């Protein structure tokens, strides 16, 4: 029940770097999942989140243009390109799931298509997170 | 020859392939039903011979005279110049008449000289 | 764009407080998607309540929550030394995206 | 000197009589396990001077034969996966893979939550229909509820694509102590005393070819066009026309289909259609021009024999109703086709290298027979599915009236089911031998 | 001199034998496809000089045709809706339209969430049920959580609304090789020789009667009040009693029920009773009061020919159990009718208009006969119910006893199918001809 | 008289439906097993009949006088005051002996006096 | 003996059994399946029989030779040196032979003689 | 000279005939309710000098025992209560109980969403299963997920704890017309001529004993050990072995287990294993060693006569596949067991007390017949049962192909069922009776 979050390095100001989060003990494949940022001294910060099969991905205006979610069902890992990276930008990156599951109505549990669970719209898994740094 | 083929015939004729029309009488739930009713048939007609003293017999000459009125007709007519489902046209109303008076004076009538003469 | 929150807030031990939190339509009055989170300081933040009122298992009897228009408030009752931690209000927009407040610092003297 | 009682045994005469025939063969519908191989050899008498009278309409063998093919397909269905399970609320919406405009509303895309491997489990699942097949059931609540056609009536049943509906030609054979009578007159009226008779014992094979306004696949008149009805001034009844040409029709549903499957329940698999590539057309029918136009002359030459001289004579469209009766129906590889005739009965007629097109629409859905006791689902071809067929007969209405021997307008019917069948079985008729007879003579 | 042995084929001699029956009918639950057509002649043969011994209760005609009305039971029932999706519970009130002291809290106002012809959805629904139909839990939380009583055991199954239950008689005819030997003599009851004796094929139609006391419909004595037993001394025994005397009673449901239908599954319909328009009233049965002490006097003196003479007898009701065996239990229209017969056995007889009103519950959940493999529902009838019929006898018991074997006592009960028919059924017994056998004379 | 007509008469006097009686021992599933089992019923008889040598013979004679420890009665004491149905049940547990006997005393002799004509 | 008592003796001597063998040969839906199957086989064989001129005759004797090219042995081998399932094996191929001369050239020239005796 | 053509009726002559046989009784699946009596004396006649030759495998009394035994198993199983609504996720958890080294992860305690009587209620509860009968879903998340083997596949039905499975022996009778031909040589190996014969109308009983690789219940060898084989050189045939002394085999559950039961729904009830009294021990079974040594060496010793001389033999376990052909199943008690046999084919002969315990395998789900149309649940058993039984036999594979061809090694084999009726159906044969015959003599 774990998010190992990786690729936190340093870049030069205009320069894009990919973050990975190696998910597991999750059938991760069958949540959602977001990623979030926390500048030091700052506040949580929603990036972008990303559905199964990514058909619905959605990012902070802040963000916007800069930022894209994808994701790998099987290797279990979710990923996010950054791309002309700010100072602005730099914070710690943490990968969050989408808690959910099946939605108990009428007596029987419903699933998505491909068995993926539902959004109940509230993040549960947290990660330990990694800094992104834009240098100067 | 073959099934029926004396049809068409004369009845003189057709008397002499009476043993082919005899061969061909006897060969998921209905295939039973239709084995039952054959066998009904036939034994139907082969106990109604068997009554008349004709069991085992193709053609029976009784001992009963008949109302000549059930077909003014000669016998020449009758043989030679016409077929069997025209003589059967001819004198439908006259078969249960006829067998009864088979039953009664044939072997119902016949076996009773039977035992009496037993001597 | 961020959900209205206090700065900090404070009181002294074993008393009961609340922190608000103040969005528009689009969360608290267009939806219960609306849910609180401790953050340790050093460390990724866990939530305390998920819509409105919810108790995720493992969080004390002693945390609640309750909603009223815009306004989102978490209750903490009979602060400890272990509530010095940030707290943030969040939502689920209408626009599908996570609107987080700006981070309430708790003070426990 | 008088005379006497004389038993023959073993006379060859006739009764008219009705009794059951064996089915005989030459996984199927038709051709199952209780159905027998023929001897090929058939004992004919080589037409003898017997002359029988008999005739359509009255031979209580169709009545039998068509029992028994109502019991074959609900036989053959019996085990099978029921589709209760789908009888949910159904989300469509436009399907987007480049439909044509003559295709625009002909298929429709639904969303819909079904049971599975486990009880307690439902998996949303999505499935393509023709729109023939389901109904919309709320403009209120929004506009994008529907439901299968059939849900609130009988239940609709669906599995065994193993098994086939080639109409393989089936014989009837007669019981023992009975014979079939068949008649070789070419020139037969369908009524009166055919003068060309021989005996079967099993009649040669029909195939079961099930349609509404053209018969297909069936004998074809060998000297003439013919006509047949059981009255001809009755504008009720169905007018059967034999052709002595086949008529070719090529066939097709242009579009390539994706076969899905997916489990409802324990081992309950259900096929549907899945993605259909490639870009959407409408499935279609041709006839050769010129040969339909024969086809029609020489009808309205037979038709005007059984009529007065230089009668005018019209083809038009039928009445509408339920879309069996309005159109031509056919199943091929299981599908079920329902076309238009438009192309085929429009001109009229005077004293004195081309096609047709019939567009077609299709059916998933269907009411097998005019009874709605039950309901089937045809699964779905894999792939692009062509047929070619013969038309052998037409069936025609006569209009309720028609004026001073003009605008004698003839439209297709269909309505009945068992003339499919009494177009081939119009030749035989069945009769009880009656070996035991009296004829008197002269003896001892 | 000597005698030889001999064979005589076509012998009049018959044998005790059990075989089973033909059916004949005069759709219903018994007049089904699989029956005969009407036997036309009942040629009805009269023996000279043949007396035989009848015993009743040994009489196998008894038993095939208890097995055939169960069996026909089954037929119709089977392809019907079945009541598994109503076994929910349900919120039960008293409802309420000028119900007087005596039928307060018997009919109740219940509802319930139903499927319907989507099983995605749910609705919640009204109907009404009679008590004897429902069961409450007491512990759990509030009594408005009823349940069918039935939903513990078989699936309670019933629909099929246009099958009449209506008894029609139905004929027995022998196979071939068996004859049926009737007996003539008036004044027999059960046991011992019937010196009057005739033949026929087929019996006469016996109504297929279902009841639990007053056997209904059926023959009447002609000479004399009958009363029949296996054993006239023992206590274990049934007395059957036949009456001379028909006498008719009055029967109904004075109810202007409405009835409502809805769609549970596909096409699977359910019928319930809705409102009832106009006030409510109690169900009962008259009985003209004089004509029913007629009847128990004409009872009495025959009692006194099998019983000694100046004995004091008195009649009581059932003992009890459930209604079945406590009311007199019949059906009318479809209806299941419990009435209370305490009012025809509240009296005492000695050593040397007015009507008779009695009570009667309703229930629609019945189970037939005393098996309970099995459950079936009672469709709701519309509009009022109004009942004629003949009592022909009586089933009565005797109390197990009395000091110095006097004031004999009787009480009606004991009413099992297979009682009932022997009252039709007694006339007749079925033998084996056995055409071949020896008599030795002088022969050679 | 019809069919039992002759039930309640003397031996006798009841000899004279002998055709009567034959003819009517001839006419879901359970329906079919009757009509099999009338079937199977009536050619049990038919069989043993012709083992006899009395196919279509409503009265036979054999080579067998009768054994008298059966039945102590005389010729017309029986025959003109029993009935039938009396009779078989004076002497019902005899009827096995007598058909086997009758089986093989009559015609394994006959069939053998019959071959030797050949020589 | 018993049913086959003589299966393995000799022709002649099977000749005492014929009157065993023929005993057992009479008497929900296999069992009608077996049982009418059973009643067919029987009739078939009545037919037979009385087409061929045996009206219950366990032996008959026909007008018939046999084609000499059948069989190249005397009756003393036939009789005593042979059983019949060895018989039968050795004349296999002519049964159908044999058959339609036992029908045909019995019958046909039996009535167009006997009806002339009538006369 | 002149000789002429006579006709013999009831001719001594056979023909090989395929017709079918009956029943015999004196409930269960097979001496039903719907089974025919038996015959209290059969009549076994010699054959002086009757020499007939036969052949087993060509036996079609083999085919007719199979599709009987198949439709007696349907017969029985169609009206039990259908296990699909117990087709749910199972929450697996540990047993709290004293296990032994060999039973840990053979257990599992299955949580469970159920249903009730009335659909509204649900109800969680738990049954023990073995892990046989239980399928991981999910091993990644959950860690927990798990549902019976098979609920993806046809449904699991059985419920009838009324009927046992005892292996009743069933006498065979054939129908009038035909005859039983029974072999009384004790050499012969099923291939040829058997010198001394002699007919039934009916054969002993034969018990309907399930197995795979040894043969349990059987009919003893008296004279010798016989082995049997359609090819000898033939390695993918199976060979009987058929032993001329038993070998005694106890086989146990020493788990004193309770039957708990829940009401599933409307009559449908459904009983599995809840407590286990006492701690968790492996079923096993008892052979006697000594006894085995013996038996196999005499088997060897005819081996070695089928086969060369001076051939080391030997036995080996069996190669794979599922455990239906890995080890000794059989029934006990309409319990199910997979025993290892390991300890029993295991050894090396030349030509130059003690027990042999296997463990065993519990299966409660079970695809009987290998047909994949179908599964049955057996129910449990209450308390601590024993099974007694003899081996009579054994199914051997030879493994075909060696270098300087030596040293035959043969494994158990036996996976399928036709073959183990072979071992009592060799000795029969059906013969059509042929009454006519024609011979020449000297007549006219
Ligand atoms: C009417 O009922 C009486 C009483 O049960 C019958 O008398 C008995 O008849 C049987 C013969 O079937 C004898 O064994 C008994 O001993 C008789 N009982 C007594 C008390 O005497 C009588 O036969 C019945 N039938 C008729 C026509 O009256
Ligand atoms: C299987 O798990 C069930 C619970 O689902 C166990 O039942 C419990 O047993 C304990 C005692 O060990 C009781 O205190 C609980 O009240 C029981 N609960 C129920 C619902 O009955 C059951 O004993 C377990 N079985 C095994 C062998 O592990
Ligand atoms: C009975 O009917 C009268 C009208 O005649 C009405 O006023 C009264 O309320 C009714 N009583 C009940 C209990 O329904
Ligand atoms: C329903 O009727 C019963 C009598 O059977 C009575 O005790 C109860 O109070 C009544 N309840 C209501 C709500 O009228
Ligand atoms: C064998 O055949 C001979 C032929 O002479 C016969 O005598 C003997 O009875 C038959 N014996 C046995 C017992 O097979
Ligand atoms: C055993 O079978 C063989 C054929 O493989 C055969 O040749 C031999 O005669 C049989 N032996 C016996 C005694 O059955």
Same mark, same amino acid.
């Given at each position: 029940?774990?998010?190992?979050?990786?690729?936190?390095?340093?870049?030069?100001?205009?320069?894009?770097?990919?973050?990975?989060?190696?998910?597991?003990?999750?059938?991760?494949?069958?949540?959602?999942?977001?990623?979030?940022?926390?500048?030091?001294?700052?506040?949580?910060?929603?990036?972008?989140?990303?559905?199964?099969?990514?058909?619905?991905?959605?990012?902070?205006?802040?963000?916007?243009?800069?930022?894209?979610?994808?994701?790998?069902?099987?290797?279990?890992?979710?990923?996010?390109?950054?791309?002309?990276?700010?100072?602005?930008?730099?914070?710690?990156?943490?990968?969050?799931?989408?808690?959910?599951?099946?939605?108990?109505?009428?007596?029987?549990?419903?699933?998505?298509?491909?068995?993926?669970?539902?959004?109940?719209?509230?993040?549960?898994?947290?990660?330990?997170?990694?800094?992104?740094?834009?240098?100067? | 020859?073959?099934?029926?083929?004396?049809?068409?015939?004369?009845?003189?004729?057709?008397?002499?392939?009476?043993?082919?029309?005899?061969?061909?009488?006897?060969?998921?739930?209905?295939?039973?039903?239709?084995?039952?009713?054959?066998?009904?048939?036939?034994?139907?007609?082969?106990?109604?011979?068997?009554?008349?003293?004709?069991?085992?017999?193709?053609?029976?000459?009784?001992?009963?005279?008949?109302?000549?009125?059930?077909?003014?007709?000669?016998?020449?007519?009758?043989?030679?110049?016409?077929?069997?489902?025209?003589?059967?046209?001819?004198?439908?109303?006259?078969?249960?008449?006829?067998?009864?008076?088979?039953?009664?004076?044939?072997?119902?009538?016949?076996?009773?000289?039977?035992?009496?003469?037993?001597? | 764009?961020?959900?209205?929150?206090?700065? +900090?807030?404070?009181?002294?031990?074993?008393?009961?407080?609340?922190?608000?939190?103040?969005?528009?339509?689009?969360?608290?009055?267009?939806?219960?998607?609306?849910?609180?989170?401790?953050?340790?300081?050093?460390?990724?933040?866990?939530?305390?309540?998920?819509?409105? +009122?919810?108790?995720?298992?493992?969080?004390?009897?002693?945390?609640?929550?309750?909603?009223?228009?815009?306004?989102?408030?978490?209750?903490?009752?009979?602060?400890?030394?272990?509530?010095?931690?940030?707290?943030?209000?969040?939502?689920?927009?209408?626009?599908?995206?996570?609107?987080?407040?700006?981070?309430?610092?708790?003070?426990?003297? | 000197?008088?005379?006497?009682?004389?038993?023959?045994?073993?006379?060859?005469?006739?009764?008219?009589?009705?009794?059951?025939?064996?089915?005989?063969?030459?996984?199927?519908?038709?051709?199952?396990?209780?159905?027998?191989?023929?001897?090929?050899?058939?004992?004919?008498?080589?037409?003898?001077?017997?002359?029988?009278?008999?005739?359509?309409?009255?031979?209580?063998?169709?009545?039998?034969?068509?029992?028994?093919?109502?019991?074959?397909?609900?036989?053959?269905?019996?085990?099978?996966?029921?589709?209760?399970?789908?009888?949910?609320?159904?989300?469509?919406?436009?399907?987007?893979?480049?439909?044509?405009?003559?295709?625009?509303?002909?298929?429709?895309?639904?969303?819909?939550?079904?049971?599975?491997?486990?009880?307690?489990?439902?998996?949303?699942?999505?499935?393509?229909?023709?729109?023939?097949?389901?109904?919309?059931?709320?403009?209120?609540? /929004?506009?994008?509820?529907?439901?299968?056609?059939?849900?609130?009536?009988? /239940?609709?049943?669906?599995?065994?694509?193993?098994?086939?509906?080639?109409?393989?030609?089936?014989?009837?054979? /007669?019981?023992?102590?009975?014979?079939?009578?068949?008649?070789?007159?070419?020139?037969?009226?369908?009524?009166?005393?055919?003068?060309?008779?021989?005996?079967?014992?099993?009649?040669?094979?029909?195939?079961?070819?099930?349609?509404?306004?053209?018969?297909?696949?069936?004998?074809?008149?060998?000297?003439?066009?013919?006509?047949?009805?059981?009255?001809?001034?009755?504008?009720?009844?169905?007018?059967?026309?034999?052709?002595?040409?086949?008529?070719?029709?090529?066939?097709?549903?242009?579009?390539?289909?994706?076969?899905?499957?997916?489990?409802?329940?324990?081992?309950?698999?259900?096929?549907?259609?899945?993605?259909?590539?490639?870009?959407?057309?409408?499935?279609?029918?041709?006839?050769?021009?010129?040969?339909?136009?024969?086809?029609?002359?020489?009808?309205?030459?037979?038709?005007?024999?059984?009529?007065?001289?230089?009668?005018?004579?019209?083809?038009?469209?039928?009445?509408?109703?339920?879309?069996?009766?309005?159109?031509?129906?056919?199943?091929?590889?299981?599908?079920?086709?329902?076309?238009?005739?438009?192309?085929?009965?429009?001109?009229?007629?005077?004293?004195?290298?081309?096609?047709?097109?019939?567009?077609?629409?299709?059916?998933?859905?269907?009411?097998?027979?005019?009874?709605?006791?039950? /309901?089937?689902?045809?699964?779905?071809?894999?792939?692009?599915?062509?047929?070619?067929?013969?038309?052998?007969?037409?069936?025609?209405?006569?209009?309720?009236?028609?004026?001073?021997?003009?605008?004698?307008?003839?439209?297709?019917?269909?309505?009945?089911?068992?003339?499919?069948?009494?177009?081939?079985?119009?030749?035989?008729?069945?009769?009880?031998?009656?070996?035991?007879?009296?004829?008197?003579?002269?003896?001892?």
């Amino acid at each position: 029940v774990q998010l190992v979050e990786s690729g936190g390095g340093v870049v030069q100001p205009g320069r894009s770097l990919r973050l990975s989060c190696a998910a597991s003990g999750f059938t991760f494949s069958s949540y959602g999942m977001h990623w979030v940022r926390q500048a030091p001294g700052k506040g949580l910060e929603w990036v972008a989140v990303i559905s199964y099969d990514g058909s619905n991905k959605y990012y902070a205006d802040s963000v916007k243009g800069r930022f894209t979610i994808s994701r790998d069902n099987s290797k279990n890992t979710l990923y996010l390109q950054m791309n002309s990276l700010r100072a602005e930008d730099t914070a710690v990156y943490y990968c969050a799931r989408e808690a959910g599951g099946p939605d108990y109505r009428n007596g029987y549990n419903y699933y998505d298509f491909w068995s993926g669970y539902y959004y109940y719209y509230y993040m549960d898994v947290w990660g330990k997170g990694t800094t992104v740094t834009v240098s100067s | 020859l073959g099934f029926l083929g004396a049809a068409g015939s004369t009845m003189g004729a057709a008397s002499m392939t009476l043993t082919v029309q005899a061969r061909n009488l006897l060969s998921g739930i209905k295939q039973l039903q239709a084995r039952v009713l054959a066998v009904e048939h036939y034994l139907r007609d082969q106990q109604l011979l068997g009554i008349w003293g004709c069991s085992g017999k193709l053609i029976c000459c009784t001992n009963v005279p008949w109302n000549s009125s059930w077909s003014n007709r000669n016998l020449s007519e009758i043989w030679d110049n016409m077929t069997w489902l025209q003589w059967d046209k001819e004198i439908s109303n006259y078969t249960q008449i006829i067998y009864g008076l088979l039953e009664e004076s044939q072997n119902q009538q016949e076996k009773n000289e039977q035992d009496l003469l037993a001597l | 764009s961020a959900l209205t929150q206090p700065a +900090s807030v404070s009181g002294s031990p074993g008393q009961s407080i609340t922190i608000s939190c103040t969005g528009t339509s689009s969360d608290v009055g267009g939806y219960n998607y609306v849910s609180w989170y401790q953050q340790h300081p050093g460390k990724a933040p866990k939530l305390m309540i998920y819509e409105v +009122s919810n108790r995720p298992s493992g969080v004390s009897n002693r945390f609640s929550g309750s909603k009223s228009g815009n306004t989102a408030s978490l209750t903490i009752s009979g602060l400890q030394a272990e509530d010095e931690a940030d707290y943030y209000c969040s939502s689920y927009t209408s626009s599908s995206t996570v609107v987080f407040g700006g981070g309430t610092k708790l003070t426990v003297l | 000197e008088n005379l006497w009682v004389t038993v023959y045994y073993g006379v060859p005469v006739w009764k008219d009589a009705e009794t059951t025939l064996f089915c005989a063969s030459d996984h199927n519908v038709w051709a199952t396990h209780a159905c027998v191989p023929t001897d090929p050899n058939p004992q004919e008498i080589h037409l003898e001077n017997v002359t029988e009278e008999f005739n359509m309409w009255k031979n209580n063998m169709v009545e039998q034969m068509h029992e028994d093919i109502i019991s074959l397909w609900d036989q053959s269905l019996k085990p099978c996966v029921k589709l209760t399970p789908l009888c949910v609320t159904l989300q469509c919406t436009n399907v987007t893979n480049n439909i044509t405009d003559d295709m625009r509303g002909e298929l429709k895309n639904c969303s819909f939550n079904a049971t599975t491997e486990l009880r307690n489990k439902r998996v949303k699942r999505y499935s393509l229909f023709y729109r023939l097949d389901i109904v919309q059931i709320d403009s209120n609540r /929004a506009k994008s509820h529907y439901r299968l056609i059939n849900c609130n009536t009988s /239940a609709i049943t669906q599995a065994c694509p193993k098994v086939s509906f080639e109409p393989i030609p089936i014989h009837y054979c /007669a019981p023992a102590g009975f014979a079939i009578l068949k008649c070789k007159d070419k020139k037969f009226n369908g009524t009166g005393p055919c003068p060309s008779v021989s005996t079967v014992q099993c009649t040669h094979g029909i195939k079961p070819v099930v349609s509404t306004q053209l018969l297909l696949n069936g004998s074809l008149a060998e000297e003439e066009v013919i006509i047949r009805s059981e009255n001809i001034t009755n504008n009720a009844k169905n007018i059967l026309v034999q052709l002595n040409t086949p008529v070719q029709i090529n066939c097709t549903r242009p579009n390539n289909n994706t076969v899905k499957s997916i489990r409802i329940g324990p081992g309950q698999a259900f096929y549907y259609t899945g993605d259909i590539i490639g870009d959407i057309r409408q499935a279609h029918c041709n006839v050769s021009k010129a040969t339909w136009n024969e086809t029609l002359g020489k009808v309205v030459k037979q038709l005007r024999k059984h009529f007065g001289n230089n009668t005018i004579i019209r083809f038009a469209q039928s009445s509408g109703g339920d879309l069996e009766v309005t159109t031509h129906s056919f199943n091929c590889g299981g599908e079920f086709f329902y076309c238009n005739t438009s192309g085929l009965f429009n001109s009229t007629w005077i004293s004195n290298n081309d096609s047709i097109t019939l567009p077609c629409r299709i059916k998933q859905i269907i009411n097998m027979w005019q009874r709605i006791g039950q /309901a089937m689902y045809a699964p779905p071809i894999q792939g692009v599915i062509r047929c070619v067929s013969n038309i052998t007969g037409l069936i025609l209405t006569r209009d309720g009236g028609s004026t001073n021997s003009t605008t004698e307008t003839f439209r297709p019917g269909g309505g009945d089911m068992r003339d499919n069948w009494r177009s081939e079985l119009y030749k035989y008729k069945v009769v009880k031998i009656e070996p035991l007879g009296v004829a008197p003579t002269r003896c001892k």
